[PDB]
Amino acid sequence: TPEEKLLRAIFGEKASDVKDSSLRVPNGVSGTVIDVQVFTRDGVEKDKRA
Amino acid sequence: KPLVGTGMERAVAVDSGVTAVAKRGGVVQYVDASRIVIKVNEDEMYPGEAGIDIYNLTKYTRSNQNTCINQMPCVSLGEPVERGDVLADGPSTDLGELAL
Amino acid sequence: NGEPIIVPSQDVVLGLYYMTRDCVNAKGEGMVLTGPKEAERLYRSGLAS
Amino acid sequence: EIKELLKLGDLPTSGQIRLYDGRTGEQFERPVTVGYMYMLKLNHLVDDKM
């Protein structure tokens, strides 16, 4: 909207193109991470953690 | 355990496969929070492939109801065990008796 | 029906009941009390059942 | 047999003992039934309902 455009102007906040979609803990549950598994479709290059 | 049970706790706790039950009698050669190694008795051994018996316990893992199923060894080092004896108390069992 | 719907149910009626029954010879029988407040004082101080 | 087990443990065969109110320390009349019951915790946990 025009006002958000004026915002991005006055503050130079570059409106990024990547939306956030990260996976976050549901509210109310507070625990310990005890395991992380990573599957990747073959062909895809593995990242460090995998 | 239940102080007041009906004597049927043992059959339930054993027949459901939540515990690690000895398959051949022997002596506990190495017990660990994650495995139990039994040195089988002679008379139960086969001619060849003398060997031992390893039991890998299931550590903290998901149920279908999101509860932790997790086995603890109830035996100690050098103890003698017999066939069909309980070696690792599964979830909600204690010394091989169902304990809800 | 015009009857109350806020009647006390179970522990409260048992409380009132047990409180309000009489034993045929109990501690502090046959006194003459100067009012309800004295009755409560007696009972709490353990002089009358 | 239960009464006998209680006598073996030097406990009132009536199964009812005398209690005191932890808040005031005066005795409840009419001895109450104390004992040991096996209680389970069913998985209708409240933080999965609210």
Place this chain on the structure above:
Amino acid sequence: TEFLKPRLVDIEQVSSTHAKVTLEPLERGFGHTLGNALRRILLSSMPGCAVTEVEIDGVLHEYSTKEGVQEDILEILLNLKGLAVRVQGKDEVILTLNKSGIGPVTAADITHDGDVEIVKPQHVICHLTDENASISMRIKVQRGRGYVPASTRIHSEEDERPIGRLLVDACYSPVERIAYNVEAARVEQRTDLDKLVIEMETNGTIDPEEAIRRAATILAEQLEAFVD
């Protein structure tokens, strides 16, 4: 280590002989320990001066009757019991109530003494009917602690007393009613705190607040041996 002592204690007094003292916040469960200690003390062990035994001029038993006074002797003693006194020096005094004239005999009609003092002069004692109007009695007020019925004194009749010695239940303690609630409180973030509420009514001889203070003082006196 460091404990949460009450701040913002307020005492609302309705009908001066009756007060409601709320006191907060206190640590968890301190509501009950404090409240009940004070209750037991105030109720059961507190010094006072009360009527104990009477000797009416010419009557023998509580079930007997005195011609001319409408109240039965039971109601007479009952009125007597609620009469609230305060002696100064003597740990025991005898008042002689000797009144004639048809009408309401109240406490005001007692022969004046020095250390003695009555708090409700219009507290009626009895009624005198027509044309006869002559009541006479010796009430015995006595300093004692707590509350002692008469059945004890007759089962503990260490002194076989003369006839007409009618025992009254000694209500020594000034408190007439003492109750306490404990409700929830909070110091802005901790919810598990107690607000104590002490509702107390006394027999005039001592303001409620004063009685609470002197009871707490008795208790502190008791503990004086161990504190540091």
Place this chain on the structure above:
Amino acid sequence: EFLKPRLVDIEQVSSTHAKVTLEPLERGFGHTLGNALRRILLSSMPGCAVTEVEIDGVLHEYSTKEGVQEDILEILLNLKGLAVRVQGKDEVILTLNKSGIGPVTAADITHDGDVEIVKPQHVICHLTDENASISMRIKVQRGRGYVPASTRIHSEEDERPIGRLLVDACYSPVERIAYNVEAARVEQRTDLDKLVIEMETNGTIDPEEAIRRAATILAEQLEAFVDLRD
């Protein structure tokens, strides 16, 4: 006009169990003092209790350590009930290093100066492999009451080392209080009870010191009571 009580003999039937006595108690006061002290003692006595643990190569209590018999979680539960008295500081850190088959007890804790254990045969865990070893650091704090880990997360304040394992703090050293009043006839008196307080602690607190402390708390509360300034 009252007779005030005196602390009299402290029978000590064990290291954890002790019967103290308060002799010249007026009538009806026995129960008052007794129950007041019982509430105070059970609720608010101070004590020291292990608060967090850091074992060498573990990340969270839902793991296991090669060579030890218990899961880590059972080890934390065993530590939670470890009973210890410290003198100087308000929080110390104990070191427990051990290797070799056998039990691992409180005796194995590297002896510090001010820290005194009260039952060094308490079992921490079991090693079951000759070359397996554990090495842990146990933080012992001092507090009172019961502070679970969940609320201590209020005071999170940079708990970055993921190896840090919070255990729930049960600081209170008192396990069970009971008391009986009973007549103790002074030479010329018709009504003089005597209060016998039986008290079972985890031997980290001295009986006389405990009762004295409770009396102090009670008197300090009554202090706000004795002057009703409104």
Place this chain on the structure above:
Amino acid sequence: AAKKMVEREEAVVWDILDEVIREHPVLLNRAPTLHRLGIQAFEPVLIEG
């Protein structure tokens, strides 16, 4: 900003909450609402747990 505040649950939002709750009644309804007492209004007391 206020959304971020109530997500942090800063100790001020609890005071504000006790403030907006003050006289505001809420409706409570139990599962099989058989008759009209199955829905009643109450005034809330903020409670732990």
